[PDB]
Amino acid sequence: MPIITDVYAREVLDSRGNPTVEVEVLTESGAFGRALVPSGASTGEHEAVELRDGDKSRYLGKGVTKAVENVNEIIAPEIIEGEFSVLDQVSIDKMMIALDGTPNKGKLGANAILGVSIAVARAAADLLGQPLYKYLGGFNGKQLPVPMMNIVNGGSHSDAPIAFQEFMILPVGATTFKESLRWGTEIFHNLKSILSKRGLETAVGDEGGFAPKFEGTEDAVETIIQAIEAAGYKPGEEVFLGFDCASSEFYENGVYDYSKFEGEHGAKRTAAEQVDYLEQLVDKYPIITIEDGMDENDWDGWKQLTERIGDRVQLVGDDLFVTNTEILAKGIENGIGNSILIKVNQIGTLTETFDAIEMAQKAGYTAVVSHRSGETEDTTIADIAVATNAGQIKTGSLSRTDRIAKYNQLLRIEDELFETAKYDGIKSFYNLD
């Protein structure tokens, strides 16, 4: 019996110890779904906005009681009085969008809306007795993603003289996701040993990776490569590197100003020099993906970067696109990037999330389903990656259950799929030559 009979929100905590929204949905027959909403460390703009309370007497102003109230007192009665079927996902998502009535979900909160959106879908899958990836994506959802695994952090997430925010490993050469996960974990533990022996810090950041005091970018990259090799894997064949440059954080007045993070002698690069520099790095090192290599508003620079190395390196828009199909469409039309980081809570409904993934795919772009800095015990993004046969995921390093829970769910999905599972390895990069 599919009619939704209860929609209930509560305030819980995320992986950084900040409040977030949890929603539970029940049907008449007792089918049940629970969703928890993630939260970003920094937000691109043109984005759906999370509602926070700003009551400095609670949680330093980061309470989400208003968003919770919006679910319990506004959204819930609309759903229950409307006698919506739990199966009518698009109808419910459209209803919430209209109920809020603003372009950025700023009245009810993207956190209120997404909690309900995901909890409904989870309840629907429970009702049908379907794996969530098959409910979401249909019968042919079967492709496990290549994980891009955080390993070293820089920029504003570190004190080392390194401008790029994040360095990742990608176990592209593995034959299964289960194997890929083991490779990454082995490399992580090997790097930890290397860091310890060098007297560098091995405590972890928000994503479960390291932020060691390397000498600079080349030291960081070569040390990761050292770990890959020590673990017994082949860089540039079995395991590749990725960056999240987060270049907007050091771009100002037409200059990519590396002195912001790399000390007084750090290079001040024009957009042309920035492209040259990224090209030099991908020629020197086995780098298969670069996120936000150019500034969020530097469309000319993005075009040049894409013309320069886009045939052989994935170029992921994060801050560039902010999971916004209007911006994505503009990107596609202008030959900008070849991949998009998909953040469910940046847009705020599952319907819109899937629309963005579909738009990307139909343009020959990859859609990389992503975590946020503040995660939860929710593992829905694992199922979204498989539902859409996305082929890639970005969900953290190899420690902290806020990351590992997603990897464990991918293990379960691959196990359940059995002989029907596929892991396409390097062929996951259908956006590249």
Next chain:
Amino acid sequence: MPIITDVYAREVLDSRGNPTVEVEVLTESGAFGRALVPSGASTGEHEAVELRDGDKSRYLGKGVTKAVENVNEIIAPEIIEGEFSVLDQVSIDKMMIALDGTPNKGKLGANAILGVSIAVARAAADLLGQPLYKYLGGFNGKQLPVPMMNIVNGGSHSDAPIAFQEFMILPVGATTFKESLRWGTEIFHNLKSILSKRGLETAVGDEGGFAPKFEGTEDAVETIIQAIEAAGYKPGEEVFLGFDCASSEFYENGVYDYSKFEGEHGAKRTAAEQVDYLEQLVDKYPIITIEDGMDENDWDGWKQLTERIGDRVQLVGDDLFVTNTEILAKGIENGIGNSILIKVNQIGTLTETFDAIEMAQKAGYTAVVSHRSGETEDTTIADIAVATNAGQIKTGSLSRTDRIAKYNQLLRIEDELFETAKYDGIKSFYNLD
């Protein structure tokens, strides 16, 4: 409906990126339970042994394929062919204990056995439609625990000149668990700010807390107190401190050798001087609980410590008791400690876990249900704490979902209990007079 029809194990990852056991149980009617096992020890004279593979080609020898196979090929057929009801928890636990046939669960593995033990109970609660805490503890399970929250680490978990392994905060004075959690989180964020302003490290360890380069024990303690106050709480009334001294890690040849961690000039204390020192600390600072203040084999020293401050300070045996009712019984008979840290995987079944909690309670000891360093997305320990009205829990700092998931489950339990919930605050320490 209740006959178990499937028992299935798989290898997943824990919060440190090490393999562990997951088990799923199904009944004929489709009731379902999933358990994940936290990290343990593969050796240790008096505790239950986790089984690891030792295949250095996988996960550096830390695979759990053998334990998984033991579930799938040995335990599962015994259960299924035996037509055990999912409700017959004690029967199933006793059967597994006999099936392994060794005192330390070293044949099948405590990790195999506990995975099944917990998954069965979770499936039973699902079958009955009961909250797990009520299934486990009966109708009167209703007391939320005071959380002892990791905040600063020392000893072998840090590079600072501090011998004690862990410092904790306890929001004893809160009126509800939900408020207690907020207090702790606010204190955590305030400490983080204080550390940053001092130029100390704010990256986190395995339990989600900090390991800053303090000048020593007094600096650490006073800085935590500073954070408590900055967050707006009263030390020694609303919020107390706790230690895990892990004193076995610096005791040798009859000496508590603080020079092991606190540099060349660090004190070498006899057992008498160790007791004097702990007494001095509890007289100076608002310390309500001390774990492993004396060495695991220094029973004479434990007795002296208990006589000295046990009337007004909780004295928790962890390494002292290793969740072993034979050792606990010896402790009780000899007036040793007044609390025990209860680690489900250290004993290996829910039945034995509950027996240990009950033995402790009936002696006027508190039973503090505990996490391990390697945790998972499992939240069963939250329900165990409420089921037994234990009154205390030790499940980590205020970051990392491996910890926060337990706190979120306690929020859900308190919410569900509604007007029947109780949080006893300082009266939780029924072991103190």
Next chain:
Amino acid sequence: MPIITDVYAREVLDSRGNPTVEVEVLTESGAFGRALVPSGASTGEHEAVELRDGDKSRYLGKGVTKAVENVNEIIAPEIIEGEFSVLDQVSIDKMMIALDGTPNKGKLGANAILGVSIAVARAAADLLGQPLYKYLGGFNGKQLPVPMMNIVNGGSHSDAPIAFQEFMILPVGATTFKESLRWGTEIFHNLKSILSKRGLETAVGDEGGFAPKFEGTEDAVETIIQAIEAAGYKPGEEVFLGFDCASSEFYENGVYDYSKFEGEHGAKRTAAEQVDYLEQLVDKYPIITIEDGMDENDWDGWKQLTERIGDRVQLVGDDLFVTNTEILAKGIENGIGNSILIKVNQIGTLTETFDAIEMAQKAGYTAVVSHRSGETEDTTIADIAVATNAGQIKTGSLSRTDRIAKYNQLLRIEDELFETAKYDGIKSFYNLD
């Protein structure tokens, strides 16, 4: 379907031929529970009070039509209109406590309230298909009690020159409850034969035991020991003795006045001499438990008694505590007694009963679940003893179904538990050295 749809009370008779309350509860799905309420011969004060009609035209004023009406016309509609789930025991108990609104349950009657409280729990266990002890106590309720079996009566329950109200046997050395019951029964029949041969009376009193015209206390005790030995059992190893002194019934103006029951030459003992006397008896005879050895208000005397023999003899507060957690807490804080007699109807709800048991256990006291002088065909107290692993029960001699029904239910519980049952024998006395 757990919502309570009917709550119905009727006036029935207890084992002494006095009216009492019966309540039946039904759920929407047809789950059913029936409870009957016991009644004491004499009442301690500070107690929940039973409501009687005082209509001397019916049952000599002992009718319970008002209490029955209070269930049918006040409590029942509150429950039914409230749509309470039969599983929400604590909520329903708290609701009734508030509905009555007085400290002693004197408006609605403790008999009205307890009838509903127990019938609800019985219906809940029926709904879930659980044994009542597992519903009440959770999965680990498995310990059968050592029974303290009435055998000889004195004081105001006899015409013999004996001040103590009750003498009991305890089959502590048996390996199972089933064996323990047989031992007691054999001893009972042997005593009956001994009494008959001596020309003493073998008719029974309210609890199913004897009140023979012995020469005094030593005659009674030695004759019981004679019966134990004649039955082939070892006094002070296999079978121990117990007293219920009911000392309040002969204490006045600071004197334990044995002349009240033992004739003109009976000793008038100070509190100090009373302690000396009880100590002498426990040194001479295999006495393991003494109930109400000191007067209900003689706290100094209780303290002295507890210091004197409390390490090796159980000291049970009955009139001392009147199943009142405020009085119990005061006792615990002052080192008074080491056991409490738990009378469900003296407090009036299952929630409060369990709270009292838990408070006792967590203080290292035993909780002895008890009958009343006026019993019924209800056997709930058997399930309460096992639910809480209490380890002891006091439910009568070895005749009269008002007593034997409880023993039969313990047989069924032990049978059902099969290999999971435990009977701890002497180790049941965890309150003693």
Next chain:
Amino acid sequence: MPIITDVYAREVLDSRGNPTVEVEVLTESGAFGRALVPSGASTGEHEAVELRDGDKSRYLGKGVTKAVENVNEIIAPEIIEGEFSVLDQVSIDKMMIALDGTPNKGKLGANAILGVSIAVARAAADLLGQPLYKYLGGFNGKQLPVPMMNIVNGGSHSDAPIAFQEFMILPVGATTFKESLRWGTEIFHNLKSILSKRGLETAVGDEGGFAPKFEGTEDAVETIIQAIEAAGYKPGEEVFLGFDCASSEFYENGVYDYSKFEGEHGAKRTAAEQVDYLEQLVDKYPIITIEDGMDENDWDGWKQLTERIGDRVQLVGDDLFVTNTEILAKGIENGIGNSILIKVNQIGTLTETFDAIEMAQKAGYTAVVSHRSGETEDTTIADIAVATNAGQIKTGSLSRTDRIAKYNQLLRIEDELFETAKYDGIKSFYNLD
């Protein structure tokens, strides 16, 4: 649904502390019945034999492990392998009779057979959702019995100089059973007061009544009458007396020898003088019923007694008929008595019990459904009395739950019947003119 899937026996205790048989029956759908068997006789030419173990190491040889084994190992597999419907009562009873194959049920035991017989019927009523009296007797079972209530005992059940075994009160003049029960209880308590004031014993015997040291038969009778009046009732209109003379216990060699119980001067009466004596008593006192007034083999004396007073006094055969339809038929044919005491366990199946009741009724005799000295918490005889509209029951005095449980069940039956219940009072004696 109705096929019997489990038949299980266990050894429990009766109201005298002697072992007896309990049986539980389950159907495929979970319908459930439990029966307990009352005390019987292990020898006796014309009745069904209870089987006892004779192992003097257990319960003084009174164990029923063999009868229990006969159920579990012989009867149960026949039923289960036979796929008998729980509704097929007569088939099952006939099968057991044939399975035992002896006239007195001495191979399997009448206690084994009756336990199964009753448990089956109780399970059938549960399956159908019918009150047991309607299942047993059809839609028109509605007549509550006049209770003949034990109050004073003599003969071998007392030490007083009184030959008759039992004196009873019968609240014939009440308008409902519920009122009749109150009358009896009030009389019982009034007698107790009278006895206490006279310094006579008020402890109770097996049936819950008194055995005081009266001066003789007239003292006993007149004192009971005093109690009736003191309670406010009219002897010989509202409340009548009954005897159980148990005359076989003092008849030998053609003489009713009252000197056996009434001292050296007690009358030695011929059968003619015995009839004269009983006639004198019924002329002097309001006696409506006499059980076993003549010896079990004195058929000529029974005939004379019946001719003398049978038109106006009920004459109940107990030892005369031993619930044996062959003996009853002989009695009917010869004009012997006008009532039979029906003891379910004396014949051993419900089918045979109902056949005996029917034979009696069709002869214009009353069938008085009876307890035994050793009773249990079973209340089936209450339902049998109503099922057959018997109009009378003999189930004990007004104390002990072994008796009171039956009266409570009659209260429930009358309550359930509501406006359809009937209590025929004096018209219940349809055998008298």
